[PDB]
């Protein structure tokens, strides 16, 4: 019979030893060997409150990824050191409670993150979470089981980030083609405009429910730095900055074929870890391709709309805890009393 507590967690994964990919190397020396068998138990007739915005597991994961990137993705300049090209493809990470501690997991299929949960169970580990770092769009995550879910520590307060949990993924295919000749930094992502705009209309329809039927408008970000005005993400080791203006086109339809986002590979990065600007080596040679699932969106809601008929939303990002938070929302650690 538990109690809300914070225990230092431990990680488990199916990482391959002697693999050159940095996620496998970190998981091999930092997550449990052992090869565990965690198990579930339904808590019959039981209800419990959750808060995905006040979750210590979020900061536990955040400590891991920061440690993983510092050991694996070293910048040439911060400090003037080595910076080799590395193998980079995130793998799932499971988080597990030690003895005397359990994770409580919400099985409500329309759970929004905060509040009471009816289908509560106790598990030893979380599901496999891929630690994908990105802005504006959440990549390669899990999908909402039933409806599109709007997540917010408080949807009335405009200062609190919103996580849109898509119930169906939209594939985005980013490439920096090969061939000493030309701007080797130019890149691009291709998206199905028909697919994407169908989902964006469903997000628009779901946002309308929350804001007493109100013209929902999308505006590319003004404030913030390159990594948050642009859709940012690491692909095979390289830092990608993609202009997402075509995705938040309030127009869209003579406009629903293949959308091509212009991208760039950047060398000097304002680190998501807070540690400032850091410079990496120029792009590797050859075809750099990543095909990912868009599984969520990060939005800010403009202020000063209480006397209008419109709500205006902008793609956000910047705090990676929101990314971990988007996959850990159904969990909470509790000390077994």
CB of 169 to ligand NAG, least distance (A): 4
CB of 109 to ligand A1AS5, least distance (A): 29
The two structure tokens encoding residue 303 = 């202020």
- 234 scored as a contact of ligand A1AS5 (CB under 6 A): yes
Task: Please give the sequence-ordered ranges of beta strands (E in DSSP) within the chain, or none if there are none.
Answer: 10-12, 41-42, 48-51, 94-96, 101-106, 114-117, 120-123, 137-139, 149-152, 162-176, 186-192, 215-218, 231-235, 238-242, 258-266, 268-270, 277-279, 288-301, 310-315, 331-335
CB of 10 or CB of 195, closer to ligand NAG: 195
Check: CB of residue 173 under 8 Å from CB of residue 289. yes
CB of 331 to ligand A1AS5, least distance (A): 23
What's the burial of 56, exposed, middle or buried (CB within 10 Å: 0-12/13-18/19+)?
middle
- Measured distance CA(194)–CA(259) in Å, rounded: 9
- Residue nearest ligand A1AS5 by beta-carbon distance: 274
Q: How many CB atoms lie within 10 A of CB 220?
A: 16
Helices 56-72, 321-328: crossing angle, 10 deg rounding: 130
User: Judged by CB under 6 A, which stretch of 46-54, 127-135, 203-211, 245-253 contacts ligand A1AS5?
Assistant: 127-135
- Residue nearest ligand NAG by beta-carbon distance: 115
CB of 169 or CB of 232, closer to ligand A1AS5: 232
Quick one: what does residue 227 bind among ligand A1AS5, ligand NAG, none, with the CB cut-off 5 to 8 Å set by partner type?
ligand A1AS5
CB of 7 or CB of 119, closer to ligand NAG: 119
- 196 scored as a contact of ligand A1AS5 (CB under 6 A): no
Residue owning tokens 């939303």 = 313
- 225 scored as a contact of ligand A1AS5 (CB under 6 A): yes
Angle, vertex CA 203, rays to CA 218 and CA 126, nearest 5: 120
Q: Which residues bind ligand NAG (CB under 6 A)?
A: 89-90, 107, 112, 114-116, 119, 132, 139-140, 147-148, 150, 152, 154-157, 167-169, 173, 175, 190, 192, 194-195, 202, 206, 208, 213, 229, 233, 235, 243, 245, 289-293
Contacts with ligand A1AS5, residue ranges (CB under 6 A): 133-135, 225, 227, 232-234, 239, 269-272, 274, 318
């Amino acid at each position: 019979v538990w109690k809300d507590a914070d225990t230092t967690l431990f990680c488990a994964s199916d990482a391959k030893a002697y693999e050159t990919e940095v996620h496998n190397v970190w998981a091999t020396h930092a997550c449990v060997p052992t090869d565990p068998n965690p198990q579930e138990i339904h808590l019959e007739n039981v209800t419990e409150n959750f808060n995905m915005w006040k979750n210590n597991m979020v900061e536990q994961m955040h400590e891991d990824i920061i440690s993983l990137w510092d050991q694996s993705l070293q910048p040439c300049v911060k400090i003037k050191q080595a910076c080799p090209k590395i193998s980079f493809d995130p793998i799932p990470i499971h988080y597990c409670t030690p003895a005397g501690y359990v994770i409580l997991k919400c099985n409500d299929k329309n759970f929004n993150g905060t509040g009471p949960c009816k289908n509560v169970s106790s598990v030893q580990c979380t599901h496999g979470i891929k630690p994908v770092v990105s802005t504006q769009l959440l990549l390669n995550g899990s999908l909402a089981e039933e409806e599109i879910i709007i997540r917010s520590e408080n949807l009335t307060n405009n200062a609190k980030t919103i996580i849109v949990h898509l119930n169906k993924s939209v594939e985005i295919n980013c490439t920096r083609p090969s061939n000493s000749g030309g701007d080797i930094r130019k890149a691009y992502c291709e998206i199905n405009g028909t697919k994407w705009n169908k989902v964006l209309k469903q997000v628009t329809e779901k946002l309308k429910e929350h804001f007493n039927n109100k013209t929902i408008i999308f505006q590319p970000p003004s404030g913030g730095d390159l990594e948050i005005t642009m859709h940012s993400f690491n692909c095979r080791g390289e830092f990608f900055y993609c202009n997402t203006t075509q995705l938040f086109n309030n127009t869209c339809k003579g406009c629903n074929g293949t959308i091509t986002l212009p991208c760039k590979i950047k060398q000097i990065i304002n680190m998501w870890q807070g540690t400032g600007q850091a410079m990496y080596a120029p792009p590797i040679d050859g075809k750099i391709n990543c095909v990912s699932n868009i599984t969520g969106i990060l939005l800010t809601r403009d202020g000063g709309a209480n006397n209008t008929s419109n709500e205006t939303f902008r793609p956000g990002g910047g705090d990676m805890r929101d990314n971990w938070r988007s996959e850990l929302y159904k969990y909470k650690v509790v000390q077994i009393e």
